[PDB]
Design a protein around this ligand. Structure first.
Ligand SMILES: [Mg+2]
Ligand SMILES: [Mg+2]
Lengths: 233, 247, 238, 111, 244, 198, 241, 240, 239
């Protein structure tokens, strides 16, 4: 009937849990779906732009941070923009000062240590949004899974969002294949596209619903909007 | 329970916490003081936790200025630190501006000004101590003063605060006239203090001092006319018990 | 509950604070020599995986002042530090090394301030400072979390306070002086261990204990080995 | 005392052709009566089909360009890679430059 | 009712305080926006307490720049704030780049303003406790995406629209609009359109006093239709109904 | 420096103040009033540093008018000049002093008598029968010491002053372009605009 | 919305927090001030009694605020002293600036404005004092002003505050001729004051007084806080043993 | 019992217990002080086949001579490391000589300390193991949420601490003279495997690091490569 | 859900609402304009009258030579606003020469009333207000009302305070929207009778202050106001 241990981000449950942070992950599960998958020549983000009404635009979920880096998001736009924004600076600091392009492992570090603060101090609340990051440094391709709980994990591919399961599995299986798709972009994508269409229920994806992003060995981070993705349907 | 706990007005007008502070007062040790035409006396019981503590290292009647000393009843610690700042304010806000030391009245008020701060402000509990400050100064003569945690203060002829006040205040009330010399008082003090004890009544177990007269000895220097000596006199364990003779 | 007066002016957080000091579970006793001072504390090492070097409830604050604390190790290391630096800052700002009795004042002062202004929860530890200053010699002053200190001719902190106490008290009504008659520390040390063993209905090996000695300006912690040899000393003579 | 400024020679040039534009400027670099490098570029592309160059005191110069090339980048981030009309760039520079009014950039710059 | 305190998360991961603020905008009088490849229209229901208030006093539609207009809905005090930040955000940009700000880029700034409120701050100071009790109908024209229309929501998010309506009878119109709107709508068409859905889901007899109407074009910029134009336009409206 | 005069008479005060404005070489305006009425019966002429001058005056003016509607009661010449001096006193030890000298003429209604206060930029005040800041005194002070009488009519004063002027013209190097004259009395302020045709 | 906090507003636009304090007054000694066409009177009855308390080389009810202005307290002792202090300061800044005596109206106002200040912000409670201001300035002559903790001030012909000031109040409404020379007032003072007492009878010791007066022989204003003696005496003059 | 600052009727801070409670709940970490230098190991838990191996490192170096690992709340751990990183590097700039492990702990203990003093902050949710060398030998300690830490001959926390505990117990007696630098690693390799048998249905990846004047050369190096493999196999045989 | 800096389910800030409940508790004010004037009427809570007539306060307050205002609600508050307004009135004139626009003024005032409804740890001004005057070098009468929340509004004639609802009604069917009261004399005549509803006899409870252009201003005397009560009761009896 009752539960007092869920007041602020600051209080521990008798067992050692933070319900507030647990809830933020729930709003993460509420937002639209999105996918990421890597190999050795490129990285790909594919997302399902969801619109409000029928007379309105679809709210985008991809963002660039440098020629070589980006991410997708599942959740609250505001929260996301902030995080991605902070991220943008971090790369710039490196480039100007040291003139070196920011390594992804490290990019996750900072986004951990950042979102971390909100779990330890009173007053605030935690970030309501998850992100799949992609990039191409000197250790080739990389892909990250980030949670508001400050946990960033390095993967081979994944999905987040509502009904994110079906893709996570499609991926889990078709792995052995795509990790080997090097030199071919359109292939990684079609692959990614299939992994996602493997999660729809309302209906199929159109030119307006779809959005893709890529980055690689000679492919600075670029995004494909609407009629430009036309082919991949 | 009520609208007590916190710094805000109870339905009538009674300010909350303050009264519970004046509780740690009433519960505290018994202490008194008498203003007496050519001297003033302040004293308090020295109820020892245990005989393993050499209580000889903790003043209850303490020196504020070579003309003013004071005493308490309530939360030991509050008095210890309250004093030190109190001494400073008597400097920074007076002696360093004027060259000399401050009259009773003002130093008290200055202490009260501090007693005040602790109230008008959330995030800070007031002091659990009432002070009996006794002193003198060339223009107002001898003075007696009480200071509650509520900041406020009054000018007395003599009085007590603590466990045995209801009683003592009555005993004192009987034994007072306006011509009494100091030794009369000193004597009279003990006899009030008499009842108010549960433990012993020897020297080392009674803390008392008084404001009397210049001690040209105590200075350490000689050659300056106007600089003659402190009036504050903390009677030591010896001088006391001897006065136990004439009861 | 919280830090502001009860209905009988006794704000319990300060009271509660006390049980926790005790709660650690160790017994600390202290007595004066004639040209030295000493403190006894137990050294119960449970976990067979630790290292007795790293254990202790007594630390070297100054060149001549030591400190023992019956209380929880985290909170102690704190008090340890601040105090350790107050003296450091003192000698600098004033020309002469800070005495026992004084440190204990800013120390109690400090714990009072906290308590009244609410800038943090009080530390749940009782600090027992020792040394010998050339103004009052063998000095011993103690401080509690309710911000308050005083003097002891010889004291004790622990789950079993009054026992260790009463003994000394009785030994004092007879020896009649306010300290321990004797020239050598080794000898005094012997004396205390003695008065403690007798006081616990318990015996200690050469590691089950912890003791310190304050000399003529050269405070040092008693180590594992030298410690045993006093048990040798006080075995036959008993 | 310390003299925070210096001159590294150089000469640049800009002509506005009918439907083109040139920004030329030599590659020498100097100090007193000495040489520093036979080859050292002072003219740059900053993207968005816009060339820049700042001659006078190298350090203040290249810092401005750097500080600018970044301010271009950031313009795209906040306005969806909208191209910077040259006219715009200049109004922007004015500010950058004026930022350090009471400790200027010891340079004549051209775009 | 536990779970209603600003930065608090519902166990389904939701923020009601926010959601209620939306419920504020409801109480506002109705506002409607229509985007046509010809120009953009902004029309609002006025609703006046007494006949002694001077209609023009209600600034439900306001100019943000020669190229950008706006209509608000809900809390009037809060409006004035957003309107002022916006007005400033615009000019500032022009001072820095000698050009005009992209409608959305502007809109962005405004939403950037909204969600910038803390509760003691877990890092960033945000002096302003709760969210805004108002939404916006930003409607302008930059030369990159031509005519544009936007919806400003207190949540710090927004959407682009062809036609949208906020205020009291939100759905009453949104439904209507949902099936009245089509690209090749001319401007004259659009006016008589807004003017119809208002009257319908409006409250009283429609007339220039209870309805302010405006529009903005590449040509002249944001212009707030005086009472004449509006008055007659009512006629071209209430006349065609008679027939069909 | 410029010209600032003032003379207290019977039941009024008179303020003279040159009209020209100079920028190193050329002379811009030459019909410039260095005046600023503080309240219905108080008035202040001034001369000083180019910017410092006109700013300070208005600022002082502001405060007064404020006080005067807030209270609804008018402030006395005496007290006014006290405050001005206050402000300059601080000004002088400020990170940047307003370099400005002034004359303050007013009619104290309670005493039903006219008061005149001279005050330099250092914050130096004094009630006087007449005065002049800067070099202006040297050339005139004598004639005033000579002919001045406390009882003089308003007209008597003008003549005197008029004479002081004729002198300033005759022996002063600078061309001050004439003077604007003004009178403060139980009736308030009016301008002797006629001093062009006179 | 009930009691607590000053920043709270009850469903009917009431600030309870205030209304309590604004009433807390009904606990202090009865203070009275009266106007006459030649002088102002401040009368006050002491409280906190016992038999071991001095009051001669002190007071705590009648405080001299300016050589031309005086006030009668009735609230929290601790509070009063704070305002009394800053009230004195400000009065002096007026002097130091305009080199003139500060007008009563003005002074009262500024104080009422601080009391009001504490009436609207979180983290502080309103002052629980009430003052009878009495003074003179050549702008509007003699003036009797009053103010509560609500931060409102008032011009009065003759007023009272504190205890039984409803009873005491009405007694005044009877006898009061606008011109009523001072002595009739000083007299009236006691008449009004006696009638409203829990003491067996009115004893000098437990009583405080002062008056303000000015003229042609003084040319300026003189005020007197009455010393222990003068009182013990005028009391007899009004026929009291 | 609900706020961080407060005390219980008989002196107890509950928030810290729960802190502890969460420390246990997480993965298991260990460390061992040997001949000269130390050896650490943790338990990365492969939850899926989509995790790049040899990747998400849970162990971190400090300066260039201090190994370090923990378990409980991962971001809390990371955070704490940073502070430790400043303190170190600041000290270093100041005294020149690389920071003494003995004091280091306190610097951290003192920081973990604070988060038990105010209510506005949250207790540190991790137990931390670490060590390194210097002039007077190698050391190894273990810091808890309470801020209380000490020196151990080897440490352990997270899920199954007893497994490794009784396991660490043995070593003491048979090698009461410090275990071989080399054998230390391979032994640690085993002690982990044994303690993992809770997440048994779920595979995992073991990570190891160490310090030694002889092996690492005063430094802290990541046990990866060849020695790394055999150290596993070594464990794999005894794994029966 | 009342301790506002938070929202009701239906999106209310009940505190801000309640505050208005105090303006009703207070006295009453009413303003009217013509094509040359703007009159401000108010009542007088003549309740405990044993106080000097002379210096004790009166609702209407001049903010600048050409502008004035009135209120209803907490006197305690009101004063502080008036002061801060008067100050801004000059700060403008100083930094801009040009004297203030009545619209601007109000916006400033409303900005303050508005400031006291955002930061937690402050409470709203229990004061609603009428502000009237004529812009610099302008002959168009301006009337505005501001209230506690922060909203400002221009009215042809409006009323606030207790029983405003009533007189409002009255006004509604008297004030001709098409043409405003021409002459000043009668513009007053109007306002006066509009207050006679709540007054309860006696020009001893009715304050009138009149404002014309070119910074003219002028409060009314008792008999003047009486000669109206007179010339109105007369036509009432004539009906
Ligand atoms: Mg452009
Ligand atoms: Mg706390």
């Amino acid at each position: 009937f009752r539960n007092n241990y869920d007041g602020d981000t600051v209080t521990f449950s008798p067992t050692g849990r933070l319900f507030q942070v647990e809830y933020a992950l729930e709003a993460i599960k509420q937002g639209s779906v999105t996918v990421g998958l890597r190999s050795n020549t490129h990285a790909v983000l594919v997302a399902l732009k969801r619109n409000a009404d029928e007379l309105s635009s679809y709210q985008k979920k991809i963002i660039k941070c440098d020629e070589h880096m980006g991410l997708s998001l599942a959740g609250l736009a505001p929260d996301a923009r902030v995080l991605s924004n902070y991220l943008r600076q971090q790369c710039n600091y490196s480039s100007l000062v040291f003139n070196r392009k920011l390594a992804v492992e490290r990019a996750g570090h900072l986004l951990c240590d950042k979102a971390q603060k909100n779990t330890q101090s009173y007053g605030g609340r935690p970030y309501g949004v998850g992100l799949l990051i992609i990039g191409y440094d000197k250790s080739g391709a990389h892909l990250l899974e980030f949670q508001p709980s400050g946990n960033v994990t390095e993967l081979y591919g994944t999905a987040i969002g509502a009904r994110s399961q079906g893709a996570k599995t499609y991926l889990e299986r078709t792995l052995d294949t795509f990790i080997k798709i090097d030199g071919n972009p359109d292939e990684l994508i079609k692959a990614g596209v299939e992994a996602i269409s493997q999660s729809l229920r309302d209906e199929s994806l159109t030119v307006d619903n779809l959005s893709i992003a890529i980055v690689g060995k000679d492919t600075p981070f670029t995004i494909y909007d609407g009629e430009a993705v036309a082919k991949y349907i | 329970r009520y609208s007590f706990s916190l710094t805000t007005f109870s339905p009538s007008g009674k300010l909350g916490q303050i009264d519970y502070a004046l509780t740690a007062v009433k519960q505290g040790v018994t202490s008194l003081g008498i203003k007496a035409t050519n001297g003033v006396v302040i004293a308090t019981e020295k109820k020892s936790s245990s005989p393993l503590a050499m209580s000889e290292t903790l003043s209850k009647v303490s020196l504020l200025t070579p003309d003013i000393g004071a005493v308490y009843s309530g939360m030991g610690p509050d008095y210890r630190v309250l004093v030190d700042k109190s001494r400073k304010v008597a400097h920074t806000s007076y002696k360093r501006i004027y060259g000399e030391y401050p009259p009773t009245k003002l130093l008290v008020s200055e202490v009260a000004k501090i007693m005040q701060e602790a109230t008008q402000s959330g995030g800070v509990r007031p002091f659990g101590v009432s002070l009996l400050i006794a002193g003198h100064d060339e223009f107002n003569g001898f003075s007696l003063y009480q200071v509650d945690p509520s900041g406020s203060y009054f000018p007395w002829k003599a009085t007590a605060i603590g466990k045995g006040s209801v009683a003592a205040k009555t005993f004192l009330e009987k034994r007072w006239n306006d011509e009494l010399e100091l030794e009369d008082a000193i004597h009279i003090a003990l006899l009030t203090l008499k009842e108010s004890v549960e433990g012993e009544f020897n020297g080392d177990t009674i803390e008392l001092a008084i404001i009397g007269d210049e001690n040209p000895d105590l200075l350490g220097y000689t050659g300056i006319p106007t600089d003659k000596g402190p009036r504050f006199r903390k009677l030591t364990s010896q001088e006391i018990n001897d006065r136990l003779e004439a009861l | 509950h919280i830090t502001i007066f009860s209905p009988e002016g006794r704000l319990y957080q300060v009271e509660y604070a006390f049980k926790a000091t005790n709660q650690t579970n160790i017994n600390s006793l202290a007595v004066r020599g004639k040209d030295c001072t000493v403190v006894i504390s137990q050294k119960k090492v449970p976990d067979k995986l630790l290292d007795p070097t790293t254990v202790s409830y007594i630390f070297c604050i100054s060149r001549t002042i030591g400190m023992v604390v019956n209380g929880p190790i985290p909170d102690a290391r704190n008090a340890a530090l601040r105090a350790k630096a107050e003296a450091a800052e003192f000698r600098y700002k004033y020309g002469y090394d800070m005495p026992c009795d004084v440190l204990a004042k800013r120390m109690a002062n400090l714990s009072q301030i906290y308590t009244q202004r609410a800038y943090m929860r009080p530390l749940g530890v009782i600090l027992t400072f020792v040394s010998v200053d050339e103004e009052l010699g063998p000095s011993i002053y103690k401080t509690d979390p309710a911000g308050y200190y005083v003097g002891y001719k010889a004291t004790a902190t622990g789950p079993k306070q009054q026992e260790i106490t009463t003994n000394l008290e009785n030994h004092f009504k007879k020896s009649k002086i306010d300290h321990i008659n004797e020239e050598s520390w080794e000898k005094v040390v012997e004396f205390a261990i003695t008065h403690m063993i007798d006081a616990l209905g318990t015996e200690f090996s050469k590691n089950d204990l912890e003791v310190g000695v304050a000399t003529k300006d050269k405070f040092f912690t008693l180590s594992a080995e030298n410690i045993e040899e006093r048990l040798v000393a006080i075995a036959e003579q008993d | 005392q310390f003299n925070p400024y210096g001159d590294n020679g150089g000469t640049i040039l800009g002509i506005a052709g009918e439907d083109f534009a040139v920004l030329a400027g030599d590659t020498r670099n100097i100090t007193d009566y000495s040489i520093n490098s036979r080859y050292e570029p002072k003219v740059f592309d900053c993207g968005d089909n816009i060339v820049m160059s700042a001659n006078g005191f190298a350090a203040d110069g290249d810092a401005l360009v750097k500080r600018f090339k970044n301010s271009v980048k950031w313009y795209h981030f906040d306005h969806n890679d909208k191209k910077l009309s040259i006219n715009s760039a200049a109004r922007n520079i004015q500010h950058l430059l004026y930022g350090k009014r009471f400790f200027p950039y010891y340079v004549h710059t051209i775009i | 009712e536990y779970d209603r305190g600003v930065s608090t998360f519902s166990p389904e991961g939701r923020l009601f305080q926010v959601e209620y603020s939306l419920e504020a905008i409801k109480l506002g009088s109705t506002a409607i926006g229509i985007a046509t490849k010809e120009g953009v229209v902004l029309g609002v229901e006025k609703r006046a307490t007494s006949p002694l208030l001077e209609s023009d006093s209600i600034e439900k539609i306001v100019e943000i720049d020669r190229h950008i207009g706006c209509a608000m809905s809900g809390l009037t005090a809060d409006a004035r704030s957003m309107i002022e930040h916006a007005r400033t955000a615009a000019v500032t940009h022009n001072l820095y780049y000698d050009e005009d700000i992209n409608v959305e880029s502007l809109t962005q700034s405004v939403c950037d303003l909204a969600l910038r409120f803390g509760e003691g701050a877990s890092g960033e100071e945000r002096l302003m406790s709760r969210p805004f009790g108002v939404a916006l109908l930003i409607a302008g024209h930059d030369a990159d995406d031509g005519y544009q229309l936007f919806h400003a929501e207190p949540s710090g998010t927004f959407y682009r629209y062809n036609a949208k309506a906020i205020g009291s009878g939100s759905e009453g119109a949104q439904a209507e609009l949902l099936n009245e709107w089509h690209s090749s709508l001319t401007l004259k068409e659009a006016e008589l359109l807004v003017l119809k859905i208002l009257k319908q889901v409006m409250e009283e007899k429609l007339d220039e006093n209870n309805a302010q109407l405006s529009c903005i074009t590449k040509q002249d910029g944001f212009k707030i239709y005086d009472n004449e134009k509006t008055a007659e336009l009512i006629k071209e409206l209430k006349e065609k109904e008679a027939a069909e | 420096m410029d010209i600032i005069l003032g003379i207290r008479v019977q039941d009024s005060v008179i303020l003279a103040s040159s009209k020209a404005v100079t920028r190193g070489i050329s002379v811009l305006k030459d019909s410039d009033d260095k005046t600023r009425q503080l309240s219905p019966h108080t008035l202040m002429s001034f001369a000083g540093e180019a910017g410092d001058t006109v700013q300070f005056a208005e600022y002082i003016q502001a405060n007064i008018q404020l006080y005067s509607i807030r209270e609804d009661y008018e402030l006395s010449p005496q007290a006014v000049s006290s405050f001005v001096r206050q402000e300059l006193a601080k000004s002088i030890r400020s990170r940047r002093p307003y370099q400005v000298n002034v004359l303050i003429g007013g009619y104290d209604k309670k005493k039903n008598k006219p008061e005149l206060y001279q005050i330099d930029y250092l914050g130096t005040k004094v009630e006087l029968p007449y005065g002049a800041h800067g070099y202006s005194g040297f050339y005139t002070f004598s004639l005033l010491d000579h002919h001045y009488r406390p009882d003089m009519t308003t007209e008597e004063g003008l003549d005197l002053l008029k004479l002081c002027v004729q002198e300033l013209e005759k022996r002063m190097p600078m061309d001050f372009k004439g003077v604007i004259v003004k009178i403060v009395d139980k009736d308030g302020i009016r301008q002797v605009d006629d001093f062009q045709a006179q | 919305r009930y009691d607590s906090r000053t920043t709270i507003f009850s469903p009917e636009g009431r600030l309870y927090q205030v209304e309590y304090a604004l009433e807390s007054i009904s606990h202090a000694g009865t203070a009275i001030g009266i106007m006459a066409s030649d002088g102002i009177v401040l009368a006050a009855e002491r409280k906190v009694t016992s038999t071991l308390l001095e009051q001669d080389t002190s007071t705590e009810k009648l405080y001299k605020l300016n050589d031309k202005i005086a006030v009668a307290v009735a609230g929290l002792t601790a509070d009063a002293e704070i305002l009394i202090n800053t009230a004195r300061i400000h009065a002096q800044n007026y002097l130091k600036t305009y080199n003139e005596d500060i007008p009563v109206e003005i002074l009262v106002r500024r104080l009422s404005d601080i009391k009001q200040g504490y009436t609207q912000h979180g983290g502080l409670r309103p002052f629980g004092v009430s003052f009878i201001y009495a003074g003179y300035d050549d702008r509007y002559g003699y003036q009797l002003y009053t103010s509560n903790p609500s931060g409102n001030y008032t011009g009065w012909k003759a007023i009272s505050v504190g205890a039984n000031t409803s009873a005491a109040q009405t007694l005044l409404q009877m006898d009061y001729k606008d011109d009523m020379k001072v002595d009739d007032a000083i007299e009236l003072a006691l008449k009004t004051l006696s009638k409203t007492t829990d003491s067996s009878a009115l004893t000098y010791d437990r009583l405080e007084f002062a008056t303000i007066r000015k003229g042609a022989n003084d040319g300026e204003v003189y005020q007197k806080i009455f010393k222990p003696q003068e009182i013990k005496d005028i009391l007899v003059k009004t026929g009291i043993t | 019992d609900l706020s961080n600052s407060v005390f219980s009727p008989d002196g107890r801070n509950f928030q810290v217990e729960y802190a502890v409670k969460a420390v246990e709940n997480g993965t298991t970490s260990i460390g061992i002080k040997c001949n000269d230098g130390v050896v650490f190991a943790v338990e990365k838990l492969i939850t899926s086949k989509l995790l790049v191996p040899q990747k998400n490192v849970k162990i971190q170096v400090v300066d260039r001579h201090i190994g370090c690992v923990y378990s409980g709340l991962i971001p809390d751990g990371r955070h704490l490391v940073n502070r430790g990183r400043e303190e170190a590097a600041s000290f270093k700039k100041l005294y020149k000589t690389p920071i003494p492990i003995p004091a280091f702990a306190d610097r951290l203990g003192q920081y973990v300390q604070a988060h038990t003093l105010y209510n506005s902050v949250r207790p540190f949710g991790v137990s931390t193991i670490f060590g390194g060398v210097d002039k007077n030998g190698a050391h190894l300690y273990m810091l808890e949420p309470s801020g209380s830490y000490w020196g151990y001959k080897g440490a352990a926390t997270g899920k199954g601490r007893q497994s490794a505990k009784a396991e660490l117990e043995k070593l003491v007696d048979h090698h009461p003279e410090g275990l071989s630098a080399r054998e230390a690693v391979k032994q640690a390799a085993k002690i982990i495997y044994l303690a993992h048998e809770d997440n048994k249905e779920k595979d995992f990846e073991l990570e190891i690091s160490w310090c030694s004047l002889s092996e690492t050369n005063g430094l802290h190096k990541f046990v990866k490569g060849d020695l790394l493999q055999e150290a596993i196999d070594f464990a794999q045989k005894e794994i029966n | 859900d009342r301790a506002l800096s938070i929202f009701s389910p239906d999106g209310h800030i009940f505190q801000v609402e309640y505050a208005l409940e105090a303006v009703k508790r207070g006295t009453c004010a009413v303003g009217v304009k013509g094509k040359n004037c703007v009159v401000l009427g108010c009542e007088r809570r003549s309740t405990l009258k044993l106080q000097d007539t002379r210096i004790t306060p009166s609702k209407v307050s001049k903010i600048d030579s050409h502008v004035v205002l009135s209120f209803s609600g907490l006197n305690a508050d009101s004063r502080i606003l008036i002061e801060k307004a008067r100050v801004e009135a000059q700060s403008h004139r100083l930094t801009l020469e040009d004297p203030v626009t009545v619209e601007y003024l109000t916006r400033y005032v409303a900005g303050v009333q508005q400031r006291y409804t955002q930061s937690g740890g402050v409470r709203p001004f229990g004061v609603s207000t009428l502000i009237a005057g004529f812009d610099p070098r302008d002959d168009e009468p301006k009337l505005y009302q501001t209230e506690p929340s922060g909203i400002y509004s221009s009215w042809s004639a409006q009323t606030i305070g207790r029983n405003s609802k009533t007189v409002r009604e009255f006004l509604e069917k008297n004030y001709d929207r098409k043409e405003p009261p021409a002459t000043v004399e009668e513009c007053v005549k109007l306002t006066v009778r509009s207050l006679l509803e709540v007054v309860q006899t006696g020009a001893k409870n009715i304050e009138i202050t009149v404002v014309k252009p070119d910074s003219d201003i002028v409060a009314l005397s008792s008999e003047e106001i009486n000669q109206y009560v007179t010339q109105i009761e007369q036509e009432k009896q004539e009906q």
